[PDB]
Design an enzyme around this catalytic site. Structure first.
Site, short mmCIF file in Angstrom:
data_model
loop_
_atom_site.label_atom_id
_atom_site.label_comp_id
_atom_site.label_asym_id
_atom_site.label_seq_id
_atom_site.Cartn_x
_atom_site.Cartn_y
_atom_site.Cartn_z
CE1 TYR A 154 -27.92 52.46 0.93
CE2 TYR A 154 -28.72 51.46 -0.92
CZ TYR A 154 -28.44 52.57 -0.20
OH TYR A 154 -28.43 53.67 -0.75
CD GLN A 169 -20.76 54.90 5.79
OE1 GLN A 169 -20.16 54.02 6.65
NE2 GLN A 169 -21.41 55.87 6.67
CG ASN A 221 -31.24 62.55 6.46
OD1 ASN A 221 -31.97 62.15 6.27
ND2 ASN A 221 -29.90 61.99 7.19
CG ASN A 241 -22.64 54.97 -0.43
OD1 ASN A 241 -23.56 54.52 -0.74
ND2 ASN A 241 -22.44 55.71 0.43
CB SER A 293 -28.83 56.54 -1.70
OG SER A 293 -27.61 56.44 -0.97
CB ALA A 321 -30.84 60.96 3.40
O1 LIG Z 1 -30.69 56.01 0.77
C1 LIG Z 1 -30.88 56.66 1.91
O2 LIG Z 1 -31.82 56.93 2.27
C2 LIG Z 1 -29.74 56.57 3.10
C3 LIG Z 1 -28.74 55.34 2.66
C4 LIG Z 1 -27.67 56.09 1.81
O3 LIG Z 1 -26.92 55.27 1.41
N1 LIG Z 1 -27.68 57.15 2.11
C5 LIG Z 1 -26.66 58.04 1.92
C6 LIG Z 1 -25.50 58.02 2.42
C7 LIG Z 1 -24.27 59.05 2.07
C8 LIG Z 1 -24.50 59.84 1.07
C9 LIG Z 1 -25.86 59.87 0.51
C10 LIG Z 1 -26.99 59.22 0.78
O4 LIG Z 1 -28.13 59.23 0.32
C11 LIG Z 1 -28.75 57.68 2.91
#
Ligand SMILES: O=C(O)[C@H]1CC(=O)N(c2ccccc2O)C1
Length: 358
Positions: free
Chosen positions: A147, A117, A340, A149, A61, A315
């Site tokens: 928040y 998602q 992660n 995606n 992200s 992550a």
């Molecule tokens: O930002 C973060 O640390 C979390 C929140 C998020 O959208 N993540 C995430 C979720 C799916 C794929 C990649 C990502 O980085 C991890």
């Protein structure tokens, strides 16, 4: 490196790696226009490949910052406006609930609860239209931040539509190439595969799986060197020669909404400096898990504030990334890991390093 930088980095990161069982880590500290690099452990455990300044990590992200800046660049080019209705760039989105949902809402997670998602079932572009058409907002636009995606991911895809370029082409041509990010990729080329670190989840080697709007939401891979350069570019946008890119960076750090102590930019998130780690963690989405918060509109948005902790966490399944900088102190940090590990630990470590050097 200056010994102060060496000491604070090593004394902070070494225990972090031990505590979190991180296989490989790269860290950059940017101090007054200068980067300093540090690496530990393994990009690939099985093949005994060390982490170098050239290994690629999945940003997850943290990619949203690139998307936000590309969107800002498109605004600067006069191609889009954040006040534009979503339907202006996707007229086939005719479902009523979309009336009043702007590009701003998409970019800032304030559309009314777009899902975190995109479902794995969404495989085609007709699947994607169906998804957004059938989505039912729980809230009116611009009332709550969730928040997501599917929110900024859609913003990314629509922001590039007037240009006629694919999202990848637009990102390469308008952001990566002008900033000399020559080892930053949405799709890792065969030539760079030797440098692509494996992520580690439950002891297994993993890479991010393909998904709808992945490039736009979480798809960027980069080196510690390129990421240091990315931070410097965002720290000091006035040094950037390309007019619209300079302006784009400035627009990404504008404060559009306030929830608690945090201000929402385009990709980037901001808090006023000085601030303590416990307030940063409280102002953070530590996991991709539902946290619905009422937002207060900043009308009009405050231009990039120099005295800010500007940051983003990322992550994927097997990686953990963190970027933070304080513009007024010419100070920045990048933390890239192939596991992660909990976000509060990232924030704690980053604050410890930056607080000592400021
Ligand atoms: O930002 C973060 O640390 C979390 C929140 C998020 O959208 N993540 C995430 C979720 C799916 C794929 C990649 C990502 O980085 C991890």
């Amino acid at each position: 490196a200056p010994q102060q930088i060496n000491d604070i980095v090593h004394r902070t990161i070494t225990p972090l790696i031990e505590q979190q069982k991180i296989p490989g880590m790269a860290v950059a500290v940017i101090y007054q226009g200068k980067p300093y690099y540090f690496t530990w452990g393994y990009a690939d455990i099985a093949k005994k490949q060390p982490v170098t300044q050239q290994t690629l990590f999945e940003l997850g992200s943290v990619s949203k910052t690139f998307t936000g800046v590309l969107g800002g660049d498109a605004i600067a080019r006069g191609e889009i406006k954040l006040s534009d209705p979503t339907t202006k760039y996707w007229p086939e989105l005719t479902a009523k609930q979309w009336n009043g949902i702007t590009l701003l809402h998409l970019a800032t997670y304030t559309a009314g609860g777009l899902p975190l998602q995109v479902p794995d079932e969404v495989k085609s572009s007709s699947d994607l239209l169906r998804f957004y058409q059938n989505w039912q907002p729980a809230w009116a636009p611009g009332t709550q931040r969730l928040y997501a995606n599917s929110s900024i991911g859609l913003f990314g895809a629509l922001a590039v539509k007037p240009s006629g370029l694919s999202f990848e082409q637009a990102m390469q041509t308008r952001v990566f190439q002008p900033l000399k990010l020559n080892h930053t990729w949405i799709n890792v080329p065969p030539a760079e595969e030797k440098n692509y670190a494996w992520g580690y989840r439950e002891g297994k080697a993993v890479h991010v799986s393909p998904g709808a709007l992945d490039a736009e939401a979480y798809g960027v891979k980069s080196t510690i060197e390129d990421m240091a350069r990315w931070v410097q570019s965002n720290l000091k946008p006035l040094d950037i020669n390309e007019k619209t890119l300079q302006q784009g960076i400035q627009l990404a750090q504008s404060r559009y909404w306030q929830t608690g102590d945090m201000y929402q930019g385009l990709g980037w998130e901001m808090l006023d400096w000085p601030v303590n780690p416990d307030s940063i963690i409280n102002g953070s989405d530590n996991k991709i898990a539902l946290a619905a918060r009422p937002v207060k509109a900043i009308t009009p948005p405050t231009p990039a504030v120099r005295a800010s902790w500007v940051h983003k966490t990322g992550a994927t399944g097997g990686f953990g990334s963190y970027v933070a900088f304080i513009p007024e102190k010419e100070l920045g940090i990048v933390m890239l890991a192939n596991k992660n590990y909990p976000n509060p630990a990232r924030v704690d470590a980053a604050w410890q390093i930056l607080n000592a050097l400021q």
